[PDB]
Symmetry: C2
Subunit: 214 residues, 2 copies
Amino acid sequence: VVIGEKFPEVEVKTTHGRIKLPDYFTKQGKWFILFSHPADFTPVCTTEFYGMQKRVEEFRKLGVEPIGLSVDQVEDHSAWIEWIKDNLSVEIDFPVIADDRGELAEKLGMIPSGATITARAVFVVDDKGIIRAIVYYPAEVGRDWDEILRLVKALKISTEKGVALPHKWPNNELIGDKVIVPPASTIEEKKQREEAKAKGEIECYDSWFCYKKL
Amino acid sequence: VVIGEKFPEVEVKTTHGRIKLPDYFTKQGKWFILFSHPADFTPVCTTEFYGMQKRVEEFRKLGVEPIGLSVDQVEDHSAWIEWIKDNLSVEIDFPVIADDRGELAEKLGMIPSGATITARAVFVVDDKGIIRAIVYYPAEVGRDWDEILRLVKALKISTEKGVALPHKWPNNELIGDKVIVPPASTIEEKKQREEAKAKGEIECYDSWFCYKKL
């Protein structure tokens, strides 16, 4: 699987019943973020599930659905959610795939060399079912969902507006939360630029490098 | 490609001259971060190079060497670097690979469906030539070098201390900067585990989730 690729058509067994991916999110006009985890009742992975559920509505409000996955079965899932209910007083309400046999995992590269379980994979998939971003972390280092957030927010704005987000946006070192506008060219297009450069939105460090407040 | 795998033996054309990978760094005791980017003379990408160069020393103190990659030419790189020096006052002193034609790029899945240039790919590879992490972010959304920094830190502290790192470490909501221990397979195991609580270090939620200060 490769960025810009269609997420394959695939039925999954999950904690919320059975669904067709991407269909089930795409038919709804919703993005999803598919994330894998090596093993239920693993400590790092439990802190991830904690932190995902506390950001759940921040993804949903952007119109992005988190959906989880691992090679364990739904009854291990249901127990682990119960455990996280009894123990951390947090209620898992995102769906969790039980991927019998790392069938989907192998379809989506989630299995490290020589293993049969998955690492920490993340796929940001949009309402066209197109793979927009792909993260593979190893079992020993847990993720920082706030980056995924940052990522998904930047993905939404750039899709919605036709803009690119600079490095570390919204806290970029050169231009902060300002976003970057596409290249002038044509001729009329260049008129619109330098007109707008009279204070004026768009600043530029150069012709190929202009940005504005959103 | 896939985490845990060895990094291909390949010779690359760079701004520091032709080099062989992983070799040029393994034999130094060093890790490297390889990262592709789409296009010299591009705005997002200029923010990232700026941002990498401003943290080049955070990466170097940890024994991790950055190295860039694009489908552009050496002479192409050398003019952009100079544009960075004259316009943003920062001198790029990490090597940047000229991957004429995308040979390597395509080896490592850096190219999106139907594209001929790289997206924003990151690879971390260690003193033992192994890919420990991989990211593919999209053209239109810049990376964030403090996440890759957090992750390399975590990767190093994981290899050295045997531990695992929770969600957003060293800022974990639940348990702050502390790390997670395993089940290390023995019987010296269980005594030392509980007889280390024995308030405090180590502390647990359940038998399977214990953790400790470093």
